[PDB]
Design a protein around this ligand. Structure first.
Ligand SMILES: CCCCCCCCCCCCCCCCCC(=O)OC[C@H](COP(=O)([O-])OCC(O)COP(=O)([O-])OC[C@@H](COC(=O)CCCCCCCCCCCCCCCCC)OC(=O)CCCCCCCCCCCCCCCCC)OC(=O)CCCCCCCCCCCCCCCCC
Ligand SMILES: CCCCCCCCCCCCCCCCCC(=O)OC[C@H](COP(=O)([O-])OCC(O)COP(=O)([O-])OC[C@@H](COC(=O)CCCCCCCCCCCCCCCCC)OC(=O)CCCCCCCCCCCCCCCCC)OC(=O)CCCCCCCCCCCCCCCCC
Ligand code: HEA
Ligand code: HEA
Ligand SMILES: CCCCC/C=C/C/C=C/C/C=C/C/C=C\CCCC(=O)O[C@H](COC(=O)CCCCCCCCCCCCCCCCC)COP(=O)(O)OCCN
Ligand SMILES: CCCCC/C=C\C/C=C/C/C=C\C/C=C\CCCC(=O)O[C@H](COC(=O)CCCCCCCCCCCCCCCCC)COP(=O)(O)OCCN
Ligand SMILES: CCCCCC/C=C/CCCCCCCCCC(=O)O[C@H](COC(=O)CCCCCCCCCCCCCCC)COP(=O)(O)OC[C@@H](O)CO
Ligand SMILES: CCCCCC/C=C\CCCCCCCCCC(=O)O[C@H](COC(=O)CCCCCCCCCCCCCCC)COP(=O)(O)OC[C@@H](O)CO
Ligand SMILES: CCCCCCCCCCO[C@@H]1O[C@H](CO)[C@@H](O[C@H]2O[C@H](CO)[C@@H](O)[C@H](O)[C@H]2O)[C@H](O)[C@H]1O
Ligand SMILES: CCCCCCCCCCO[C@@H]1O[C@H](CO)[C@@H](O[C@H]2O[C@H](CO)[C@@H](O)[C@H](O)[C@H]2O)[C@H](O)[C@H]1O
Ligand SMILES: C[C@H](CCC(=O)O)[C@H]1CC[C@H]2[C@@H]3[C@H](O)C[C@@H]4C[C@H](O)CC[C@]4(C)[C@H]3C[C@H](O)[C@]12C
Ligand code: CUA
Ligand SMILES: [O-][O-]
Ligand SMILES: [Cu+2]
Ligand SMILES: [Mg+2]
Ligand code: NA
Lengths: 72, 75, 44, 258, 227, 513, 56, 75, 72
């Protein structure tokens, strides 16, 4: 019945979400970025991207995404 | 030594990992022998096997990347 | 909508010579296209 | 007629849809090669116009004109199941690519998975939260279904609102994840598999959320009866599909692949 | 090489190509027989004024139509798979040679002892020496010892190619990032020809393979001369 | 009114007519491309240019013949016309979605013809293997336009599959079980299940190729840890089912034609025919790597794919023997359609048997990427699929149009085409065994005689194609209106006259239990 | 909100001969003309782009 | 050398595999060195680590099994 | 319906069993037994078995099951 599925929604499902939200909001501080190494299997550029200067990924984050030549 | 013998670890038509493993084994062995100041002739078997199996351009690329600090295998 | 032989098609069969013209342009255009594409690539 | 099937009025939307496909594809070509977004934005516009008018007409034909007899409804049930099957097989291709790459890591990667230089996300942080979110939304959409069958307007709207809210929460969490990820789509086969598989999944979450929002507004306007609500059933089936694809991504890419 | 008006396979130069010839003769007999039976039965169905148009029971005849074909398939699969496993058998090669595919030529590496390597290009038609073969000659042949088990390793430095020598039963795809292995054993000296067997762009038709098979003593003199 | 009827259609018959017109046009394009191939090969040396222009022609030839000629004619054309009539249904389940399956194909075709007009075209093979199809070896828009062409064709067929499966399951008379539907209807349902499962995998694979070409992914690029051979697996996981998609509706039309012109009420062993088609559809999903016997897979894998591939001969042989047993005891009418069907049974068998030769991985080492493969697939496509299409066309033309063909002309056409295709393809067996590779613009001198004869055959086939257009013109020009056909008791599609009214089965059939 | 489905049933069942895509009134006509103009115009633009891209 | 340093391969309370790996590494190295006739002194680091971490009865049992031909690890 | 499940039984399920029966029949025949090595993690005896002489497993096959002391 609707009563049972509402009981599961508020008594189990949303409490789970609240606990995982608390878990996440406790491990949410920025990780220490690793030394840049210009590995040939990463930062692939076979064709320029069709936006910006051609060299930045779509959701480029300056803090954690280095370019082929290193961190900005 | 004539050529690399059959190796039951790599019994199939794809020999990529045979070349790779012997290249790693040679360079790990050569680092260990240089590290204590030991002797690289101990590493000779691995050297002959990878030189026999591996494309020159693979060896040359891997060599360049080791010198660059971009070789992705553990040595 | 019109029903029956020669009425259930997007082309007219009222006149067999007009039809021959339309069929000629239809199948001929398709057959010609690859020869003209090859000409196009060679003229580069 | 003395059959129960729907003879549909002649419609321009198949042609406008087909032309929107030409404009989107020619538009992607013109964006990737000739540095221009013009055709692509026309095609995206005509695609949204086509989908709006086509599904509006289906609402007109059913809620307003009464053409969805049980036999018509049975057909739509088969249609939606077969559509979902085709979408499962689409995802299967991306899972195949992932397992191919990850089970036999090549020398270029360091002969290991994850590859040398790849720092995966912690599957116990936001990816676990995203899992709790979509599982919870499967519970709330089930509450919505039962409320509708029991004739309860208020509780159907509350449960469906909660389902949509969770879909939006997943989407904002995943957008945030994407921005924070230290790896990109260009980080070899790890980035390729990660972003293309989770990216097509995120698109399906946005599609599924949009479908649920359509059902929410139709429910606000009293379109659904306690017995006749196939648009809601289809949206719920699609939403469960989206959940299950997430569980497979979570286990395969985030957890086993970390 | 192929000769004018040829109907079948190039003469076998390796024991495995001989096995394939015998296997093809077996399979072709069955193809001919089944093709002929179907044509004959068509003609038999079509050549009588006698009629039977009422419902016919299918159960009995469908036993024959499933069992006989299943037996024929087993009679093809048994020798097929025997040869498959023979061409995978552990042998102890005395020599390894690498070939790398390129757009549009082959390179060869003999790196068991020395670092010997060279490129192998098609002789253009305008440069052929009298009596030489259009589209098949190369400047630098693959010199190999006869009557010896050789390991050939195949890869590419660009797109897909495929390294083929029909008279030895050989075709191994050349895939960048992959080292594919085959075994080569020639029963005879001579020149053995093949052609690139994966579409690879502009000059796919024009990057042939020529093996030159010579006694070991001559192979050794040739290797020594390359120093 | 003309735009409402022909651009805004919700009618299964008019949409079937659009598909037949589309496929006939496509067939002229594919024929022209086939003649350019055989003109290049008709004498030793170079006629057009190097392998790039040549393989742009070969690639376009294959895409046009498969995606724009065979599938639109068999599934969109005969399927939309005949399926609803054969089950007494008033239309398809999704009559408006049906119209979008059709209208996606002209844009799909436009994208393919744009591929060939920009840069140097897509000279990739219809398989579009990387890295040749990648952004270094095929820089520029051509391959992306080919990919987009295949996306639109893919969506057309996936929606059409959903439509056919739903119509066939849901819209029969309530008394009619699946085991009381005609074999052509079974052949379309099974083909639609194959499309539904296979095309999404192709869509995933060519999408990965698109992203490798434009978004810096490395699915198929070893530099990123990718693998060109992964593309091959994804392509052929679609590509083997695709050839069963090409032939299954042809098997269904053959069952109807052989039954009809043998004067029988029913095909021999109906449940065996259903079993055989479902068996072929299932086995067709577990055999794909027989396209990859030279890529370097493990011996046990090659042994499995050899064995699984050969198993398809058993259900296939049940159909062949069942067609022969349908002729058995017939009052045979030697109609042009019967001639196409008898040609089919024999020539499809020959090509099927060369398929069984190729199934043997060991022998395939020597036959792979040779003209032996080309001989195999043209016997089953240019003589099986095409003969089924021609037999279906001459059998059902009077139903669709209301007019009769000249039977003597149609017999002349059959005779010319029979000589042409056999002269074209039979000698390609010799070229294959003697080692002539695929995708070559030129050949060593030894291969001259059989290439010369093959090219002469292609011209005979051209003469048959030209005659067919005349024959269709003569039928519409003369206007012989059909009065009656025999055997309507076992061929429901005829029972509403020729052509049937726009709306049929407004009052459904009466069928009791 | 109030249940106004009966009033939409009356509009969409009016015997006026309009097809369902136009039966809502003048706004349907406007949205149809916008859609078809963009589709046909965009298709003409795509053909132009092909002509341009077919030459250096 | 004081004792075996922290090893990021074995960061947890269960140190069984640390003892095992260092025992294997020592005996693999000793075999590699004795074979070419090189110097077992290059193997010293593995010897010191396994002797530090491994219970005496484990080493004694493993040594007995190598002499018997019943040691189940690959050396 | 029954008709469909009989069609699956005879058309798919039993043919599969017949094919796997053939597969097993072809790969049957005694593989050669390996060199006996008295590994301490195998041929465990912490307590005599409650049958026979206490030292034979329940479905002991002399051809392929060595005792702690080797093949009989
Ligand atoms: C790369 C792209 C891929 C292209 C693939 C092409 C193949 C697709 C085919 C699909 C069919 C298209 C039908 C859509 C409507 C066409 C409208 C049109 O222009 O009418 C011209 C034409 C009919 O002219 P008609 O005789 O004056 O009849 C008009 C009406 O009867 C009287 O009504 P009306 O007076 O209102 O109409 C007259 C008037 C005004 O009508 C209108 O109001 C229509 C306005 C909009 C129509 C737009 C349609 C465009 C379709 C897109 C292409 C697909 O139309 C005109 O005559 C002027 C317009 C001319 C436009 C040209 C279109 C030709 C077809 C495309 C050929 C390919 C060329 C590509 C070039 C390639 C170069 C590299 O219709 C056709 O296109 C039919 C095909 C031509 C006849 C071939 C017959 C062969 C028979 C073989 C039989 C085999 C199958 C058996 C069937 C079974 C029997 C039941
Ligand atoms: C109608 C339209 C026009 C048709 C096209 C025009 C093509 C002209 C025919 C070519 C004639 C060749 C010739 O010069 O014959 C000399 C040739 C001289 O014989 P030979 O050099 O002593 O060959 C003996 C070899 O040991 C024999 O060993 P091999 O290693 O030389 O032979 C292998 C090869 C050679 O096989 C053949 O000899 C060709 C098969 C005969 C045609 C049927 O056969 C193939 O693999 C062909 C595979 C085709 C697939 C199966 C086709 C089933 C056909 C349906 C049967 C219905 C029966 C009525 O005479 C023939 O045997 C005729 C071929
Ligand atoms: C249906 C598929 C199909 C059909 C019918 C054909 C028909 C023909 N093909 Fe084929 N071909 C392929 C599919 C097909 N082909 C594929 C998939 C390849 C491989 C591509 C690659 O390597 O990547 C290929 C490759 C191929 C090659 C090898 C190229 C090479 O390796 O370099 C050659 C060489 O001669 C060739 C020639 C021909 C010829 C002469 C015909 C002639 O027989 C054609 C004659 C004309 C017709 C058969 C009629 C067509 C029209 C209709 C049926 C419409 C009828 C109208 C109505 C019903 C109204 N084609
Ligand atoms: C309609 C199209 C179609 C059909 C139906 C088939 C059917 C079959 N094909 Fe084919 N095939 C192609 C189109 C088709 N093929 C194409 C286009 C390619 C090339 C793709 C590319 O690379 O471009 C190809 C390639 C291809 C290959 C890859 C070869 C290579 O590239 O090296 C193989 C390998 O096994 C194969 C086998 C088969 C087999 C076993 C069948 C079976 O389904 C045939 C079964 C039929 C019979 C056996 C005859 C009837 C049976 C009897 C009368 C009973 C008695 C018979 C026996 C006992 C044997 N074909
Ligand atoms: C937040 C939840 C999820 C959101 C979903 C995505 C948002 C934008 C685009 C939507 C379409 C998504 C579909 C999947 C396609 C490919 C890539 C999308 C995945 C994505 O968004 O990945 C991003 C890259 O996007 C890129 O390249 C840019 C991508 C934009 C252009 C893509 C063009 C390709 C379209 C292919 C169409 C094929 C359709 C197939 C139809 C099949 C029918 C048979 C990742 O960002 P990044 O900076 O590399 O790494 C993060 C570093 N901090
Ligand atoms: C084809 C399979 C059918 C099985 C029939 C075989 C034997 C009798 C009953 C079996 C019941 C199942 C499991 C019990 C435990 C062990 C038997 C496992 C299966 C078996 O039969 O194992 C055999 C050993 O049997 C042995 O020890 C035999 C030991 C016999 C005594 C059994 C002891 C019973 C255990 C108590 C049961 C507790 C139940 C719990 C109830 C739960 C309530 C909450 C294997 O033979 P082997 O020679 O070692 O190797 C083969 C070498 N060629
Ligand atoms: C803005 C965000 C950007 C993203 C853009 C991409 C697209 C997003 C689209 C979201 C989909 C919305 C679908 C709305 C459908 C509304 C019509 C509807 O739901 O119609 C119902 C029928 O269902 C039917 O046709 C069922 C129709 C099912 C449609 C299935 C939709 C899935 C679509 C996927 C789109 C392609 C994705 C592919 C990606 C690779 C009508 O019947 P009932 O509900 O019984 O009512 C009748 C009763 O009132 C009588 O008492
Ligand atoms: C790179 C970019 C290339 C992209 C190409 C995009 C291609 C085309 C543009 C798409 C335009 C879509 C416009 C909306 C289509 C809605 C179809 C629909 O909803 O169809 C319904 C049937 O399909 C059903 O139900 C269930 C099926 C619903 C299918 C929804 C349409 C999805 C289209 C995308 C398909 C993605 C394929 C993914 C699998 C790989 C209704 O059928 P009708 O015959 O209308 O009515 C019947 C009446 O009885 C209703 O009252
Ligand atoms: C492959 C070529 C031809 C195969 C022909 C198979 C023929 C099968 C015939 C079986 O039909 C039967 O014929 C019998 C009288 O003869 C009848 O008494 C019987 O009732 C009927 O069922
Ligand atoms: C109703 C149907 C719709 C009708 C179609 C509308 C037609 C649009 C006309 C404008 O065309 C645009 O012109 C831009 C400039 O004039 C181009 O910019 C691009 O090209 C420039 C060339 O100068 C470069 O700077 C850049 O690549 C970029 O700005 C762009 O490609 C192109 O679309
Ligand atoms: C206005 C309407 C009353 C029921 C009816 O129209 O008969 C009520 C019933 C359910 C309500 C919705 C549900 O309670 C869920 C949401 C609750 C949020 O706090 C506001 C928005 C929210 C989306 C509500 C808006 C509005 O108050 C709704 C839509
Ligand atoms: Cu190299 Cu083809
Ligand atoms: O594909 O045969
Ligand atoms: Cu196949
Ligand atoms: Mg190949
Ligand atoms: Na030529």
């Amino acid at each position: 019945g609707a009563r049972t599925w509402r009981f599961l929604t508020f008594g189990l499902a949303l409490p789970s979400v609240a606990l995982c939200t608390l878990n996440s909001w406790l491990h949410s501080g920025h990780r220490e970025r690793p030394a840049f190494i210009p590995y040939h299997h990463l930062r692939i550029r076979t064709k320029p991207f069709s936006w910006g200067d051609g060299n930045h990924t779509f959701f480029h984050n300056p803090r954690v995404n280095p370019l082929p030549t290193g961190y900005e | 030594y004539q050529t690399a013998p059959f190796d039951s670890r790599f019994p199939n038509q794809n020999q990529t990992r045979n070349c790779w493993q012997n290249y790693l084994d040679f360079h790990r062995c050569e680092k260990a022998m240089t590290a204590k100041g030991g002797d690289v002739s101990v590493c000779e078997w691995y050297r002959r096997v990878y030189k026999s199996l591996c494309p020159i351009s693979w060896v040359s690329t891997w060599d360049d990347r080791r010198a660059e600090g971009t070789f992705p295998g553990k040595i | 909508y019109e029903e029956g032989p020669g009425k259930n098609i997007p082309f007219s069969v009222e006149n067999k010579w007009r039809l021959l013209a339309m069929m000629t342009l239809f199948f001929g255009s398709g057959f010609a296209a690859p020869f003209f594409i090859v000409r196009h690539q060679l003229l580069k | 007629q003395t059959h129960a099937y729907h003879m549909v009025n002649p419609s321009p939307w198949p042609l406008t849809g087909a032309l929107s496909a030409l404009l989107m594809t020619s538009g992607l070509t013109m964006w990737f090669h000739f540095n221009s977004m013009t055709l692509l934005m026309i095609g995206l516009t005509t695609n949204m116009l086509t989908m709006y008018q086509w599904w509006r007409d289906v609402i007109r034909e059913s809620t307003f004109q009464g053409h969805h007899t049980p036999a018509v409804q049975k057909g739509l049930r088969y249609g939606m199941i077969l559509f979902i099957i085709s979408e499962v097989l689409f995802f299967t291709g991306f899972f195949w690519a992932f397992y191919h790459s990850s089970l036999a890591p090549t020398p270029e990667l360091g002969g290991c998975w994850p590859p040398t230089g790849i720092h995966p996300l912690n599957p116990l942080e936001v990816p676990l939260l995203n899992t709790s979110v979509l599982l919870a939304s499967g519970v709330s959409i089930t509450w919505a279904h039962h409320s509708l069958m029991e004739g309860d307007r208020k509780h159907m709207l509350q449960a469906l609102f909660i389902t949509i809210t969770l879909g939006v929460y997943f989407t904002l969490l995943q957008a945030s994840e994407y921005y924070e990820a230290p790896f990109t789509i260009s980080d070899g086969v790890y980035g390729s598999t990660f972003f293309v598989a989770t990216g097509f999944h995120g698109l399906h979450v946005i599609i599924g959320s949009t479908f649920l929002i359509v059902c929410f507004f139709r429910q606000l306007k009293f379109h659904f009866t306690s017995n006749h609500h196939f648009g809601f059933e289809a949206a719920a089936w699609y939403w469960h599909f989206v959940d299950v694809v997430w569980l497979f991504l979570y286990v395969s890419i985030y957890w086993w692949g970390s | 090489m192929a000769y004018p008006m040829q109907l079948g396979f190039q003469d076998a130069t390796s024991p495995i190509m001989e096995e394939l010839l015998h296997f093809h003769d077996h399979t072709l007999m069955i193809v001919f027989l089944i093709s002929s039976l179907v044509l004959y039965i068509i003609s038999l169905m079509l050549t009588t004024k006698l009629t039977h148009t009422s419902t016919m029971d299918a159960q009995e005849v469908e036993t024959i139509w499933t069992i006989l074909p299943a037996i024929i398939l087993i009679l093809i699969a048994l020798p097929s798979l025997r040869i498959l496993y023979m061409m995978d058998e552990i042998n102890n090669p005395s020599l390894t040679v690498k070939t790398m595919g390129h757009q549009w030529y082959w390179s060869y590496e003999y790196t068991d002892y020395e670092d010997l390597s060279f490129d192998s290009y098609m002789i253009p038609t305008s440069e052929l020496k009298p009596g030489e073969l259009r589209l098949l000659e190369v400047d630098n042949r693959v010199v190999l010892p006869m009557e010896m088990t050789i390991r050939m390793l195949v890869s590419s430095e660009d797109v897909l190619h495929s390294w083929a020598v029909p008279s030895l039963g050989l075709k191994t795809d050349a895939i960048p990032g992959r080292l594919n292995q085959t075994t080569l054993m020639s029963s005879r000296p001579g020149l053995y020809y093949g052609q690139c067997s994966e579409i690879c762009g502009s000059n796919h038709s024009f990057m042939p393979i020529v093996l030159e098979l010579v006694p070991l003593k001559y192979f050794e003199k040739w290797s020594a001369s390359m120093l | 009114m003309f735009i409402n009827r022909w651009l805004f259609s919700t009618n299964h018959k008019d949409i079937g007519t659009l598909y037949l017109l589309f496929g006939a046009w496509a067939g002229m394009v594919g024929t022209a491309l086939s003649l350019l191939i055989r003109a290049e090969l008709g004498q030793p040396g170079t006629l057009l240019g190097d392998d790039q222009i040549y393989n742009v022609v070969v690639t376009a030839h294959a895409f046009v013949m498969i995606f724009f000629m065979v599938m639109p004619i068999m599934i969109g054309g005969f399927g939309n016309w005949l399926v609803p009539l054969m089950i007494g249904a008033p239309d398809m389940a999704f009559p408006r979605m049906n119209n979008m399956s059709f209208w996606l194909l002209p844009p799909s075709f436009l994208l393919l013809l744009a591929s060939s007009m920009v840069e140097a075209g897509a000279g990739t093979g219809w398989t579009v293997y990387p890295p040749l199809a990648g952004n270094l070896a095929h820089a520029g828009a051509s391959v992306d336009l080919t990919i987009f062409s295949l996306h639109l064709a893919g969506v057309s067929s996936i929606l059409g599959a959903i439509n056919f499966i739903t119509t066939i399951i849901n819209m029969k008379p309530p008394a009619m079980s699946q085991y009381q539907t005609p074999l052509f209807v079974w052949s379309v349902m099974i083909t639609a299940v194959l499309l539904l499962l296979s095309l999404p995998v192709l869509a995933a694979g060519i999408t990965m190729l698109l992203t490798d070409r434009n978004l810096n992914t490395t699915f198929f690029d070893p530099a990123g840890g990718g693998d060109p051979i992964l593309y091959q697996h994804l392509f052929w996981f679609f590509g083997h089912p695709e050839v069963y998609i090409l032939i299954l509706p042809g098997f269904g039309m053959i069952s109807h034609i052989v039954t009809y012109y043998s004067g029988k009420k029913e095909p021999f062993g109906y449940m065996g025919m259903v079993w055989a088609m479902m068996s072929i559809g299932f086995l067709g999903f577990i055999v794909w790597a027989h396209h990859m016997f030279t890529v370097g897979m493990d011996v046990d894998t090659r042994a499995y794919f050899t064995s699984a591939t050969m198993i398809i001969a058993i259900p296939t042989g049940v159909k062949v023997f069942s067609w022969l047993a349908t002729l058995h005891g017939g009052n045979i009418k030697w109609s042009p359609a019967m001639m196409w069907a008898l040609g089919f049974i024999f020539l499809f068998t020959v090509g099927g048997l060369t398929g069984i030769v190729l199934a043997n991985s060991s022998l395939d080492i020597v036959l792979h990427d040779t003209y032996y493969v080309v001989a195999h697939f043209h016997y089953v496509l240019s003589m099986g699929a095409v003969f089924a299409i021609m037999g279906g066309f001459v059998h059902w033309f009077p139903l669709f149009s209301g007019y009769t063909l000249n039977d003597t002309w149609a017999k002349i056409h059959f005779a010319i085409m029979f000589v042409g295709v056999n002269m074209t393809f039979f000698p390609q067996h010799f070229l294959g065994l003697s080692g002539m590779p695929r995708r070559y613009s030129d050949y060593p001198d030894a291969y001259t005689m059989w290439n010369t004869i093959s090219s002469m055959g292609s011209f005979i086939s051209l003469t048959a194609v030209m005659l067919m257009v005349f024959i269709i013109w003569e039928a519409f020009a003369s206007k012989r209106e059909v009065l009656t056909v025999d055997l309507t008791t076992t061929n429901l599609e005829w029972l509403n006259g020729c052509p049937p009214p726009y709306h049929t089965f407004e009052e459904p059939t009466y069928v009791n239990l | 909100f109030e249940n106004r489905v009966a009033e939409k049933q009356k509009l969409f069942q009016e015997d006026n001969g309009l097809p369902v895509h136009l039966k809502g009134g003048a706004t349907d006509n406007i949205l149809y003309r916008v859609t078809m103009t963009l589709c046909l115009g965009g298709t003409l633009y795509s053909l132009y782009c092909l002509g341009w891209a077919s030459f250096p």
